[PDB]
Structure formats: C-alpha cells, structure tokens
C-alpha cells in the first residue's frame, strides 16, 4: 500500500506568511474582484438615478431636473460625483450634510402640497430673475419652494402655522435670500430690515439677510442659504417673515423608513442583490474590493487584491 | 506502562475554528454573563441616583427634584433615559452635551452661594414662578437660578461681576428667556430690545431674545436657553443684562475632580467594584456581556455569548 494525496492540473495560487505563490488543488476565491459595471434595481426596487442632479437640486426642485416630480419608492439614492445642476441659484443649504445623512434611512417620499400658491394672498408669483436656472427658456425658480416677491410694492408679514395633522414626519425646506446690496432689497422686499422666525416646538431661529457685495457665481451675485426641518406628528411649523423668504410649497411626507445611502457615482436592468457605486455585484463571496460604499446585504470591503482561502492540499 | 490524559464528567463547551462544540475538561469560563440587577455602591460611595430627574434638572434645581439640594460624594450620575422631570419650562440648555461630558469627570460639586438673593436690589426674584414646574401644586421656578422680572415698573441694567477667589473651578449656569411675543416682554421686562452680554477671560457672548411665536410644550409657549461656564481660578465672570436674564443664584465648586460617567438606565444596598446601567458586575473575570458603558476597575465588553477559554483538554 502507499499513503499519499491527490493532485491536479490547477494553477490557482494562495499566499501564506512564510511562503507565497503556493499552488493549491482547489481554493475558494473569497474576494469578489468582478462587478457588472452598471447600476440596477435592489431587490426589485429601482434606485433614484439623479442624472446631472444633486440632492439639493432634487429636494429643492431644479427646473433642469424635471424627471423626478413624482418619484416612486426607491432603495438607494444615486448621484454623480460633481453634478452640474446643483443649486443653480448660488448658495448652500444649511446642514446640507445633515440632511443627506438623514436621507440615508428614508426609502420613500410622498410629495404633498402642504402650502399651495393660493395661500400667498398679498405676495407676487412673478419671480423671473433666476437666469442661472434655464429650462425651456425664461426661467423663474425651483418648483418645490417659492421665492416670494413683493406685491403692489408691499411685503406683509408671512405668518403661517401649518400643523402636521398627518401621522408621519414631514421634511419642510425653506430659505433666506441674501441680496447683493440694499438696492436689490428695496426692489424685491420693501422692508430693508427683514427676518425669518421659524418656530417648531424644538427649533428656534431668527435669520437675517447678510447683504454684502459678492463674486460672480453662475452669473448671479446674490445667494440663497436654505434650511430644513423634520416636523413631527401633531407638531406645528410657524413661519414668520417680512422679507427674504423662500417659502415652502411642498413637504415630503416620510411614509417609509429603512436603509438607503447616496453612492455619489455615475443604469442597468439585471438583478442585483448588492450594489457598489462603481458597479453592481452579484455573488455570495464573503469579501469584495470594489469601493467603500455599499448598500444592502453585501460582502465586506477589503482593500487587498488576493484573498483566497486554501481549501485544498498544495 | 500507559500514557494518557485526564478525563472528567464535565459538560463545559468551548469553540474551536474547526469544530464549534467541544466537550472540554474543566475549562474556566472567562466571560461573566450574570449580574446583581441593581445599583450598588462603587467603592463604598453612593451613586447619584437622579430619580425621574436629569442632569439639567439636577444642576438647574428642579422643584420635582429636591432630594439633591445638598449632595454627598458620588461616583455615578444615574439618570432615566426618558426623564419625566427635565426642564419643565420649555427650553434648550446650550452645549448641554458638553456639560454632561464635563460632568463625566467631576466626582463632587459643593453648592455655593456665590450670588445671594440680597444682591438683586432693584429686581424681583419672588414672583418669577412658572406653572410648568409646580412645587406640590403651587407655582415655583428653579432655585439654582432666578428668573428676574421688572420691579417698580422698571428693569435696571444688571451689571455684576463675580471674581472666583477660590482654588477650584466653579461652574456658573445662567440663561436667556426667549419670550413668546412683545407683550410678554413688556409684561416681564420693561425694555423691549434686550441683550445678555457675558464676559470671561476666554468667553465673549452676546445674546438677544428671539421673540418668535412657537408651539406649546409642557403647557407653556415661551423658551429658556441655558448656558454654562467653568470659571478657572482667579478668573472673573461679568454679567451685563437689561432683560430676559435667568440670573445665577447658586454655583457648583468642583471640590473633587476625578473619574465618573453618566448612565441612563433607571437603588440597591450593596457593594460593587464595577457597575453597569442594568446591573452591577462584582466577579473578577476579563470580559462581560452586560452593557457597553462601565467605569472603574471593570472588565472588557464583548458582544458575544461565549468566550470560554479551553484551559483544559478534550
């Protein structure tokens, strides 16, 4: 008789601390080095493929971003690394990073018209100044928030007290428009000393415009710093402002919550149990090395390039 | 002769990488999975057990929390996760989490009368009582601060400076009463436009009342934002204010500055070397599954139900 062990013509190679490039009979390739190179649906739910559109451009509806006026349920927001149509009017949403962290757990919005445009009696809806946001010509503004201009040369105090009678959280976005100088104020808002006094049960703000000369950005020398809040059930948002108010028109009733993310990467159609911003991955491997960010039940990111468990005899 | 090994009738279970249930001989368990279940004395020192009371409710003396007006040496600050009596009047202690972090290393506060009520000649300190905090059903505001109001149809500008004159780091809490409207101001503080100007060696602050309409919380619509400062030795606090002043009336000398923590689980007459929010681990063993948060000569938390170390055989 003779004791021994089998062999084969395989060429898969593993590594050890003491030896390297050791040939083995059969070893499991635990590292998923392959990706389909496309973005698809996660568990039968299509993502939100914001094409050349940012979360600022989505939630504050950009006229160039009109494919998302009524969005279905999703599984992970998708955005480009440096989207172009992103706050076409210059400025920056305050706590923007907080909001995009908060949207990493909401799988669905319902756009509900909390505040129709008929609820601005003494204020004008002739707001054709945002030339930085062209869409089919003669652009006016975003659609989800209304930039109120004075009517009959007057700007009465905007005292609204919407109460979230709905039993679900609402995401209300408003803003303040920082003018170039006093000339734009008196040409837009007859009151020079303007303010906003948003008054949720938990929130308390007194904003003022920081009017000052500023540089060209997107062919506009003004700014608009936007703000957001989560109005809870039975709570009541209290807007009070006599100027420089990007009032809200739509809220986003948070009907579903779960696990989502924002991949920040540049759409396929095949089944994908897991996704990566570079491209989707479909395998049961323990590990992967495509990108840090993932979503769903996935393998575990490892920076290494060759993880191969030797399940065979050299 | 005959070589061999020790065999017993034990049923101890240990795990190896290649076989997950090995019947081992008297392997010592190094994970203590059990506890007393109650709050014990850390090194023979009484934990501060804030019963239905908070750090904000404790430091700013809450009428529902009168069992800690004079406090002995402690180790913990045990609090309820959902504290019922916590800032009864609506408000928000600014940098409250920073204050909790500072209190996570202060083992003692000697309450000291830095500012007696006789040092308020032209201002009323008796009628400043809020229905949000009832004392056995009667109105009564916090006692560690005084909610001043106008007296003799006037609110003269407080301008008071307290030199530390101690070898310890006394803590000073004050606040600003963010009122509801101009009428509440004129009823309380005769000056409509008010400012709280605080000054230390390392702290310049100017605060203004955000007189903004807001929701009703705890039966009251106003707000009171509280602010804390630690005053280093030989330093001097300087309070200037013509309104909305929740002036300080007690302070908290740091007699002892050691190691502590704040635990949010809701008293046992016992002794524990190391405590935990749910129970108290007394046995000496490297690991423990009880809770993440511990302080003292404690074991190492591990999120696993089995770490029996196979000191023995089979």
């Amino acid at each position, epitope marked *: 008789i003779c004791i021994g062990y089998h062999a084969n013509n395989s060429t898969e190679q593993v590594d050890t601390i003491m030896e390297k490039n050791v040939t083995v009979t059969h070893a499991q390739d635990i590292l998923e080095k392959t990706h389909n190179g496309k973005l698809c649906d996660l568990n039968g739910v299509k993502p939100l493929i914001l094409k050349d559109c940012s979360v600022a451009g989505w939630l504050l509806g950009n006229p160039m971003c009109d494919e998302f006026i009524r969005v279905p349920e999703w599984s992970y927001i998708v955005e480009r690394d440096n989207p172009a149509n992103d706050l076409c009017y210059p400025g920056s949403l305050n706590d923007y990073e907080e909001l995009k962290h908060l949207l990493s757990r909401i799988n669905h919005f319902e756009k509900i018209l909390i505040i129709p445009k008929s609820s601005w009696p003494n204020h004008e809806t002739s707001l054709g100044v945002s030339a930085a946001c062209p869409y089919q010509g003669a652009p006016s503004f975003f659609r989800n928030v209304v930039w109120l201009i004075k009517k009959d040369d007057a700007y009465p105090t905007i005292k609204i007290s919407y109460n979230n009678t709905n039993r679900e959280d609402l995401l209300i976005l408003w803003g303040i428009h920082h003018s170039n100088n006093a000339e734009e104020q008196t040409n837009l808002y007859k009151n020079p000393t303007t303010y906003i006094s948003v008054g949720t049960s938990t929130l308390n703000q007194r904003l003022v415009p920081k009017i000052a000369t500023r540089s060209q950005v997107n062919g506009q020398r003004g700014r608009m710093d936007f703000f957001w809040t989560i109005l809870k059930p039975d709570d009541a948002i209290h807007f009070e402002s006599n100027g420089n108010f990007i009032a809200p028109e739509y809220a986003y009733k948070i009907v579903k919550k779960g696990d989502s993310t924002i991949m920040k990467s540049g759409y396929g159609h095949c089944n994908t149990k897991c996704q990566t911003p570079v491209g989707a991955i479909n395998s049961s491997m323990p590990f992967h090395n495509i990108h840090p960010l993932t979503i769903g039940e996935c393998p575990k990111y490892v920076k290494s390039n060759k993880l191969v468990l030797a399940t065979g005899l050299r | 002769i005959c070589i061999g090994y020790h065999a017993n009738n034990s049923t101890e279970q240990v795990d190896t990488i290649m076989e997950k249930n090995v019947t081992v001989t008297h392997a010592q368990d190094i994970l203590e999975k059990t506890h007393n279940g109650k709050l014990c004395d850390l090194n023979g020192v009484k934990p501060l057990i804030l019963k239905d009371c908070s750090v904000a409710g404790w430091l700013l003396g809450n009428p529902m929390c009168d069992e800690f007006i004079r406090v002995p040496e402690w180790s913990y600050i045990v609090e309820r996760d959902n504290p019922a009596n916590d800032l009864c009047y609506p408000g928000s202690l600014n940098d409250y989490e920073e204050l909790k972090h500072l209190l996570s290393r202060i083992n003692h506060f000697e309450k000291i009368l830095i500012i007696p009520k006789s040092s308020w000649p032209n201002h009323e300190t008796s009628l400043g009582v809020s229905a949000a905090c009832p004392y056995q059903g009667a109105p009564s505001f916090f006692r560690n601060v005084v909610w001043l109001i106008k007296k003799d149809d006037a609110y003269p500008t407080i301008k008071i400076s307290y030199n530390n004159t101690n070898r310890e780091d006394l803590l000073i809490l004050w606040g600003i009463h963010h009122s509801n409207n101009a009428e509440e101001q004129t009823n309380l503080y005769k000056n409509p436009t008010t400012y709280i100007s605080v000054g230390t060696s390392t702290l310049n602050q100017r605060l203004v009342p955000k007189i903004a309409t807001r929701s009703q919380v705890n039966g009251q*619509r106003g707000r009171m934002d509280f602010f804390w400062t630690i005053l280093k030795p030989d330093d001097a606090i300087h309070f200037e204010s013509n309104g909305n002043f929740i002036a300080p009336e007690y302070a908290y000398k740091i007699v002892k500055k050691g190691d502590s923590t704040i635990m949010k689980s809701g008293y046992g007459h016992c002794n524990t070397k190391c405590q935990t929010p749910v129970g108290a681990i007394n046995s000496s063993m490297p690991f423990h599954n009880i809770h993440p948060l511990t302080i003292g000569e404690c074991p190492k938390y591990v999120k696993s139900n089995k770490l029996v170390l196979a000191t023995g055989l089979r």
Partner: antibody, heavy 125, light 111 residues
C-alpha cells in the same frame, strides 16, 4: 386687483327672500373662504356666515335658521339669499374674501383682504 | 365673545401720535400663539379695509404709521403719526371661534 361685485335687487318686502349674488371678477373662487358681513344703519358690523370653496358652511346663531347658503363655482361666484326677512334686517351687505384656512392642517390668517363695495338692501313693505 | 372699545370716539389731530384700546371678554390667544384679532378701517361711504391682522402685523399697502400690540384680553392700536385719511370707524374683530363679532367701533375724527 381682485374685485368682488354684488348683484341682485336692492329691494325686498317682509316675509320673502331677498336676492343677492357675489361675482369674483378679476380673481377666482378657489382655495379661499368667502363670507358675508352686514352693516345696519347706525350700528357696528355683524358677521352673517361664510362658506368654504368646497362648500363647508358656518353660520351666525343670530341668523342660523333662516339664511340660505350656496356657492356657484362654475361662474366664480357665491350667493347667500336671506329668507324669512323681517323689517329689522335692513343693512348694507358686504362681500368679503376670508383667508382663515381654519380647518385642516394649514392654519394661516391674514384675514379679509378683499371686500365688496356693498349693496344697500332695504326691507320695506 | 363680547368685545368693547374703550374710546368710543377718539378725537385726534393731524401730525401727532395717537392710540386706542380694544378689550375682549375671552382669552383671544388662539393655538399657534397668534391672537387672531383684526383691525379694520372704514372711511365714510367706503368698504372696510384691513389695517392690521393677528394683533400687530400690517396689511399690504398700509403705511408704517399703524401698529398694534396685545396678547391677553387687552389690545391696543397705535398711529405713530395721524393724517386726514385716518378719519373713520375703527373695528376690532376677533377671529378665534366661529361666532365672529365686532367691537362697537371707534370713530376717529379730527379735533
């Protein structure tokens, strides 16, 4: 520049229905409350009632039982014809928009921006 | 709610500050903190015009001269500087509950 124009006769006798209709010229009858307020001679204003643009009705108890309520959104108008008229109901009847949004989730009250010029009704045998 | 204006007729002069008081018989502070009291002006032979709303906030097209204040049962209107156009009846109308009522009306006239 929204105008509220009163219509109908300015004459009526006792024990019948006085006719008057309010046409919303220059605006619309959408998303707004609409109220009628009377001014008797030598007396302060008295609020009769109002109707929501859907048609939700609320009355004054002083004239709850004998006020017809109606809104006709086809031509952008609303009409409330007082019935069982007595001699004491002689008053100048004014239209008015109302911005109460009193029910529902919204609540904002600017309040009675636009009024009609008024119709001098005269109840007389 | 029963309302009353303490000046039934406020004799004013041009170019001088003036004020009037309107008192209710019920806490007019509506939920959401707003008082829900309107001040209307009515010139001789003209429809009412909303001078003020929710106690203090001015209506469109109303000068800075008018301003109101009050939270409880008491309320006050204040004309910083009076003109001939201000002559007329001032109504203080509560809008808390469905049975709306108006004050007796203060006929501001030149002294």
């Amino acid at each position: 520049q929204v105008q509220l124009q009163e219509s109908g006769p300015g004459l009526v006798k006792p024990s019948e229905t006085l006719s008057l209709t309010c046409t919303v010229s220059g605006g619309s009858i959408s998303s707004y409350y609409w109220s009628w307020i009377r001014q008797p001679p030598g007396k302060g204003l008295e609020w009769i009632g109002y109707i929501y643009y859907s048609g939700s009705t609320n009355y004054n108890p002083s004239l709850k039982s004998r006020v017809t309520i109606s809104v006709d959104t086809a031509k952008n108008q609303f009409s409330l014809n007082l019935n069982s008229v007595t001699a004491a109901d002689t008053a100048v009847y004014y239209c008015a928009r109302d911005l109460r949004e009193w029910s529902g989730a919204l609540n904002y009250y600017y309040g009675m921006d636009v009024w009609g010029q008024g119709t001098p009704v005269t109840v007389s045998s | 709610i029963v309302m009353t204006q303490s000046p039934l007729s406020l004799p004013v002069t041009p170019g001088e500050p003036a004020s009037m008081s309107c008192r209710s018989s019920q806490s007019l502070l509506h939920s959401y903190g707003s008082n829900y009291l309107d001040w209307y002006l009515q010139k001789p032979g003209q429809s009412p015009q909303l001078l003020i709303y929710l106690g203090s906030y001015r209506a469109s097209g109303v000068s800075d001269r008018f301003s109101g204040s009050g939270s409880g049962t008491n309320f006050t209107l204040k004309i910083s500087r009076v003109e001939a156009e201000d002559v007329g009846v001032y109504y203080c109308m509560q809008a808390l509950q469905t049975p709306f009522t108006f004050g007796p009306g203060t006929k501001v006239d030149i002294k």
